[PDB]
Each structure stands twice: as structure tokens, then as C-alpha cells.
Amino acid sequence: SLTEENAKTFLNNFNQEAEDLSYQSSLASWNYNTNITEENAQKMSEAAAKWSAFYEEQSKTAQSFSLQEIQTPIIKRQLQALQQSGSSALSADKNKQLNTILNTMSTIYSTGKVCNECLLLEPGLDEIMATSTDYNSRLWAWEGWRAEVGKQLRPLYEEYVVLKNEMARANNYNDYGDYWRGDYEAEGADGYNYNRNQLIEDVERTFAEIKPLYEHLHAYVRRKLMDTYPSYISPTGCLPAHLLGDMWGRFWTNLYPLTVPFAQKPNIDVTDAMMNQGWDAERIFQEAEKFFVSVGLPHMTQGFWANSMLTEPADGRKVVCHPTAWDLGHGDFRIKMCTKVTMDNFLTAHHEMGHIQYDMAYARQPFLLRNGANEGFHEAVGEIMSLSAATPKHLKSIGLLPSDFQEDSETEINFLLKQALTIVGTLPFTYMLEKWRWMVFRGEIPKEQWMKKWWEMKREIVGVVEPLPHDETYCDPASLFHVSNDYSFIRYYTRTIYQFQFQEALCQAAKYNGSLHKCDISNSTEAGQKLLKMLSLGNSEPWTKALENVVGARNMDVKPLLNYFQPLFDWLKEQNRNSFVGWNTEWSPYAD
Template sequence: MRGTTTLLLLVLLCCRTGFTTNPEIEEEELRARDFIQLLNKKTEEQNNRLTLAHWAYASNITDANLQHQLAVSAEVAKERKENWLEVIKFNWNTFSDYDLKRQFKKYSKLGSDALPEEKLNRLNKITSEMEKIYSTAKICAFDNNSTCDLALEPELTQTLANSRNPEELKHVWVEWRNAVGPHCRLLFEEYVDLSNEAARLNNFTNTAESWLDGYEDPQFRQQIESLWEQLKPLYLQIHAYVRFQLKKKYGDVVSEKGPIPAHLLGNMWAQRWRNVAQFNLPYPDKEEVDLTAELRAQNYTVDKIFRTAEDFFKSINLTEMPQTFWERSILEKPKDREMVCHASAWDFYDRKDFRIKQCTAITMEHFTTAHHEMGHVEYFIQYKNQPVKFRRGANSGFHEAVGDLISLSVESRKHLRKIGLLKSESDDPENVLNNLFQIGLDKIVFLPFGYLMDLWRWDVFEGKITPDEYNCKWWELREKYQGVEPPVNRTDQDFDPAAKYHIIASVPYIRYFVSFVIQFQFHRAVCEKAGQYDANDPSKPLHECDIYQNTEAGNALKKMLQLGSSRPWPDAIEVLTGQRTMDASALLEYFKPLHKWLEQENKKNKVFIGWEKSTKGCVNTKDKAKPE
């Protein structure tokens, strides 16, 4: 009986640990280790070659660079398919080595390279063409039709941020969408078909399922919906307060109870509203430092902005930028060429070449963006020694959260005082609330936009939204979640989603919603480790924490970053926070003083919370043409 029990325990142990005595499986796993080492070297070289070609085109938009990028993409795709055919010969699901099995799992998903060569080339050409349309689009000036060379960066972005003429804002808003959308519409329809075909070749039903697979959680969509419901009451309060203030400024252009006209919010996509903070501040009479003006007064250059960002990472015991970063990055917009100005960080997969491409201006927004993009680079550096398939964020939201995590410290008044951008020796509660409000106009108001972008695309990929419904369904979601409306009626013939870079560049967006939640979760964890936050100590609120120069916080962050995607994201988040799920409570804790103030202020002014149906939106021309 005892022998039987011992044998049973050994069998159970073998099953639990993955240990096997089958010599054929053991031999295959040994061969697989040799194979994966060779494959990783090949993949590094392929990724490097492909990224160099993408960089060349994105930093200098010419037909020659486009043709080179497409040619390299085709070469690499062919090589990857050959590698994939070897990968699927292995019975990798039986492997006992966790890391080996996880690498094979990632290699078993080929992505768009699974398409036949002709269709893959077409998909790559379509995406590149849409990016070119977006990046080279120009519109005419509002008051001078002879000036028709205004680009998104910097002219249109600056107009949306600074103009207070509603007619000029409307002109810029409409003309940008007219310059991009109609030219991308048919290309986008074809992109959806080809992208879905690629997903099916990877055993997914459509691209939405393929994108969500990266989160390794079948309940992920439900989690995201639950997080939004948890955060929605805070958004409704800040939305109501801003609408009330905008109506005082613009009068009948703004409805008392309807959605907010999108062109009045200081941003081309109404995704961040900080640019309208100056006439929305809770305490407008309080002297506020214009941080952009202060940067310029202190002779900040583009180089100094990025050196300041680097100093932050070094101060918490993370890694300085390699010399090649400073030599090869493009940190200012060149005057002699067209380029994709959307700020981005680049990993060239050789463990030493990391870059940022950003058309930097001397503004506070670009100051924090520099920290964000360098956060990506820091992540690249920390996981550079992982196998190539693990050189990614634990999920794509992690990558976006790391830079923003640093920005939460950078934007604290405590930090701004440390680096000399604030001269006052101390703050009073009104200054602090004004600052918290401005951060809220970035962080809180972004949440519904970050959510609805992929709600729309998921439905497009799943066939729930057909091409003739693209624009009207887009505005349904903008109204439902954001409470914004277009300044003029749009129609199903327009294609306003294309006015956002991530749509035409095929960049999944739910990562940003995820990042805006977990960055506060990360922030709370590192602030606790730095001794700067205590839930039971009112003198240490979360929104005043600054981890600058705290190596304990940096070391804790580094442990999570070094994992890359070698473990599922719940494992990674647990390393830093002790939690295994995404949790919005840290964000709510951070903004708790603002939330309380907004509720009181809206109640005092009898402000309507929420919004009634828009009087503007999207007109279905086919329905309109039908006889009544």
C-alpha cells in the first residue's frame, strides 16, 4: 500500500512540474533549445533591418524610402514565414521548460506575415499610404486662403491650443478632417479586409480577437468595461464643470445640457483638455506660473529638455541613455523634409541602438512628453537581455504607463520646485487644487477617448459596423462615452476616425486606457516604497508624491521592467504592486480632493451632470434620401 502511495505521489509530481520520462519528448525539447537560440539571432537581425527601414521612411517621407521600406518588409515577411513553418513542426505544448514553451507560443503567432506575399505587400502599402496622407496633409489658414501649407504639427496643434475664436477653431477642426478622411476611407476598408484575413490565418476569428490575445485574458474586455464604470462618475463631474465654464465663455455655442463641441477643448481630438485650463481653473485669481513661459525664460533647449528627463531616470538608479541615442535620435522637426511628427520611441533590437523621434517644441506638454518617450526607451534598455520575443511590455499598456508614471512625479509641484520651474517655497491648498485640476484635464478626460477608440475598431473588425456606418457609429460612441459633438453635422460620407494617427497607422489603442489606470497603480506602489505616500497620513497624499532621487522606488520599478513579457502581466504587476489585477482605486485616490471639490462646485452652481442627445452629429445620407 505504501509503495502504491509513493508511486501515485511521483506521478502527481511529474504532472505538476511538467517533468516527463518520455525520451522522445526530452530529445525534441533539447533540439528545440538549440533551434530557438538560432531563431532568436535571426529574429534580432530581421527586426533590426525592418526597424531601420521603417525609421528611414518615418523620418524622411519620400517615395524612395517608401519603396525601400516595402521591399524590406516583403523580404522579412518571407523569412518569418519560413521560420514559422519550422516552429510549428515542434510539439511545443508538451515542453516542460516554461520559458522555452512561452517563446514557442509567441513565435507560433505569425501576424500579418501569414498573408500570401501579394496581399501582404498590399496591406503594407495601404498602411504606408494612409500614414503618408496623414503626415503630409495641409490646410488653408482661416483668414487667408492664399496660405495653404498649414500642417498638423506645429501649426494646427498650436491653433487648437491657443485660439479662442470659435469660427477659426471650427475651420481648423473641419478642414483637417476633410484633408485626411476622404483620402483614407477606401484604403481603410481594404485594410480591414486584409487585416482580418491575416487574423484568420493565425487561427483568430478577426483582428479584434488577435489584438486582444496579447492580454492573455479571456475576460479582458469585461475587465476594461468594469474599470470604465468605476471611473465614469469622476469623468461626469469634470465634464459638467468644464461645459459650465465653456458656456460662460462662448455663450450659445455651448449647450447647457448637451455634449461639448469638440473644437473648443484645445485639442484636435478632444482627448486632452489642458489647453483650456486658463479659463477653467478652480481658483482663477490664484497666481499661476506659466510653465511653458518659464521653460523659455530659463533658456531650455530641446537638448536640455531631454537631458532633464534623462537625469530623472538616472536619479532613481535606472540607466542613462547610450551615446548612440543622442547621435541618432531626431528630437526636432527637420526643415528640409517631411516626417511623421507623432512622438515615438524606437528599439532597433541590437541591444544598443535606441532612439526617440519627436518634433519637440519648448512647451510644458513636450517637456512631459519627453519624459514619457524616454520611459519607453528605459523599458527597452531594462529588458534588452531577454530573449527577443520577451522584449516587450508585460502587456502593451505597461509600456505606455512607465513614462507616464514618471510624469506624475515630474508634474507634482514638489518636483517642479526641485528643478527650479516653480519659485515659491511652499503651496497652499488652492494652488495644489489648480495643479490637480490641470493634470485631471489630461488624465481623467482622456479615459473615455482611450476606451472608445478600440470599441469602434473592434466592432469594425467584427463586422458589427459596416463601411457605410463608419462615421455615424464613430460619432455615436464619441457622444455616448465622451459627451462631445462635432461643431457641424458630419455625414456617413465623411471618415473622421482617420483624423487620428493610430487609426490609419494600425496601432491598437486600448493600451492607453490600460496605461492611464495602471500608471496610478504603479505610482502608488513606488510612492509607498519611497515613503512619500501613506493612506492613513493626510500629510502624505498620493498627488504630491515625487520619487525623484529615490533609488528604492527605482529599484522596485526596475525589477518589473526587466521581466519584459517573459511572464504574463499579472505576474509582472504583482512584482511591483503586490496585486494581480488592474485596479482603478489608485487613480481615484490621486484625484480624490478634486473629485470632492467638483461635486461641491457643480452642486452649488446647479450644473447638469451628464448630457442630453446632441443636436449635431452624423447624418446618414442614405436614410435622408428615402421618401418620408
């Protein structure tokens, strides 16, 4: 007669119906993605609508069970994972207005164009900003984009921010930032309890430890760019926002041709070696399966080789063709990708296979808890697999690199620099963007100082300066994909930290003696069973305990990150001697 057993039965029925409705919706989505048609798209939309209606109805009926009476931790967690309403808190009018503004911003971003040639975002702008090396050829495109899309999204974004703040306040929260910072909220014992406000104090602390390495890398990149840009770079100034290899600068990987430690010894690519042996997509997937079984993980499903779309369909089907790992449920796991014999795709196959291995781990937990610890954990389990499968030692074991090859110091430094330009350079940008978004949603930055404070922070954290003045009439933050389209961006920082945390925690247990980046968890059954200890919990326990199960720590740890690039760190510290590591926050390319 107690409410605990009533809630238990209610959750049992809810899960019994959900494991069916979600499966139907995911299967409809997979069918739509396989052959993109107007009929399959309608079926997918109808299935998604039915699933959303069922979920929101159950949540409405679930809010009548306060968590104070639920005694069992698992039952309370199951009920809490569903009681959260979200966007349904707002009124019908407010909800429709928010949806209209969201779709308006999405459409303005997807159909954006910059002309004085006349191209779009993906066809011309990306390639130009990636490969072009001329000053104006990039400056004009950058300015046109951030002046068209930003100025067209500013008025809509201003109202969208207030609408999201009201939505958050309607859900017992304070701001939209606090709503986004709720994914890292843990509950449990005195040691396994985390709070939302506690993240703001950690993300900053974790950033102060990475400042020296990022400063050294930025100084090296500036010194290397001075050559290609003689009259557009200062010896003690910041870097223009249009000379970062990308429209926004999220990834500095496009700067590798200009920033190469040792050019006479290029990186190692096994694409030709992979083609000589006559490999193919199925062979790559079999190699990935062998690698994942060596660590001591379960074997892939028999359906993963039959129902999965591993290769591009030659039957005339138009697929989205971006790597995805689908977990439809009831023992149905598939991977969608136009796999080929290239090395990047070869490593992505192992990265995506990690998502499937994870989904195959927490399948035993209730449907309401079949998900990773946090948004930064699910994507952190797959990246570490590529870090272990893309080493010079593993490629020789599988037979891609002949045995007569020996690891060199210069090529190792080159690989470390190429990896840091994408992993170490992407952390400050994400951190600054999330800090700005949090300070905006909290109303701490007045609406009359958005772009001013944005560009002031771009110089203090990311060390980037604008090539032309941009007053409050522009909106550069909105020009980014993750900002325009509602999506969180802090997950990338936590992902980058947790991947290195897991790498070190799993490599130290495998008694490996060497550089952290040259680890190889293959032929180590102890490195898999210790990893599955966390993959089998998912969301059944607070992310603090799930983390401690692998690394032992119950919070973010950045010391392992600095240990991954330690050789490159010393290399840059010794090569950046004849310069000042840092940047003064007054230089301006637009001012004389």
C-alpha cells in the first residue's frame, strides 16, 4: 500500500511500453536514413511524434510521485529521469513562439550565403577558409559571413534567449545555462554527490592547468604563421580570427601545412599499404572487431554484419553518409557510414564501434537509465579506442606497417603536434564560448554589451583578435552551428578531458612502460574488464562513481592531459625560447 511499490509498478509498465515505442521510432529513423524518401520520412516523423506524445504523457502522469517518498535509490533515479518535463513547462503560445524562432534561426543558418563570387557555407566558405592562404581572400569571407548571418540572427537570438530563460525558470531552474549544466548533476552518498554550480568552479580550475601548454602552442603557431603572413602578425600580439584555418577557429587542424615541426618526415598514412593488401570495408570492420575483442569485450551481434549499413549502397540509395552508431534496442546495433579504405575512415570505424560496444554494455539497466554517465562520457569511450588503435605499434601488429620500420623522434613530434592542434587548441575556444553563453543566459552581460564582451573575452582566453571592428549590431556567437541550432557546447571540454583520463587509467592498469600517447591496450584482457566496470552502469549510478570505477578520481582531472603531450610540451618549450609566450590584449589589426 506504500507509494514505493506503486512507483515501481508504474516504472515497470512505462519501461515495457518504452522499449517498444522507442524501438519502433529508431527503426523508422533507420529506414528513413537507409533510403531517404518522402514516404519513409513521413513514417519516421509519425513514429517520432507518437513516441514524444507517449513520453510527455507519461512524464505528466509521473510528476505526481515526489522523490521524497521513494526510498530505493534505483527507483528514485528511474522516476527522476522521467519526471523532468523540459520544454513542455512553457505555455502553448510560448512553446509555439520558441519553436518558430528556433526553426527561423536554423533556416537562416542553413540557407546562409556570402557574396562579395557567390557561394554558400559548405560548398565555398569552408574550403576557402580551410585551404586559402591569402589575407583578403579569407578576411572578406569571414567578415561577410559574420555580418550577414550574425546581423540576421541577432534580433531573433535576443528573443530566443529570453524565451529559453523563461522555459528554464518554468522548470524550477534559474537560467538556460543552469538547465544545460544539469546533465553533470550527480546524486548519491557524501562522496558521490555533485552539484550544478560546482561545475563552474571546476571547468575554470581545469583550464588554469592547461594555460601554459596552450600558450606555448599559440606562440609556436604565431611564429610559424609570421612567414606566410609577414605584414599581418605581431611578434607580441594575438592572432586574427580569419587566420585560424576555420571560420570560427574551433579546430586548428587546417594549420598543419603552415605549422609543421619537421617537414622532411611526413606523418604516417597506411592508405596505400591498406590498398596494396586488397583490404575493404568488411576487412576493416573485422580488424576493429578483433581489436575490441582483444581487450576482452563482448563479441559483436550477428545482426551487426547483416542488417548494418557498413558500406555505401550501390542500389541508388541516397544516404546522409556521416558516421553514426545506432542502437535500436532489443539487441539491435548497427553502424551507418560510407566506409572506405582510407586511414581516417579506418580509425572512425573503431571510434564508432566504441559507441556500439558501450550501448552493448548498459543494455541490462532499465530503459530509463540506458545512457552514458554524462554527455561527456559517451563520446569519450570511443575516442580513446582510436588513440590506442592509431599508434605505430598497433599498425605493425595488424600488418599495415612492415616490421623494418622503427619509431622516430621527429615523426613522433610531428604526430603529437598534429594531434595537439586539434585537441589542445579546441579546448580554449569551447571554454570561452561556454563561459560567454553562461554569462549571457545569466543576464550578467547587459544586452548592450554582447559583442563587446565577446570580443574582449576572445582576446583573454582564446587569444584571438578581430580583423575589423564589430559593434553591438553584429552577432558572431550566433554564427556558429551549435549556437544557432540549440545544442550544448560544454560537452566537448569534458569529453576531451575524460578521454585522456580514461586513456591513462586504462594504460596504467595494463602495466605499460612508455609515452602515454604510444599506449596499446591490445593483448590486455585486464584493460577491458576494468573498463566494462563503468560501461555496464551507464546512468544507474552518479557519474562521479562511474568515473572513480575507472580512474579512481570523482571529478575532472587534467594532469593526464598534460602528460599526453609532455614530449611535445618540452619540444615547444625549447623551440619557443626566442620569443614571448603570451599576448597583450590591446593590439588591433584594424587600428594603425
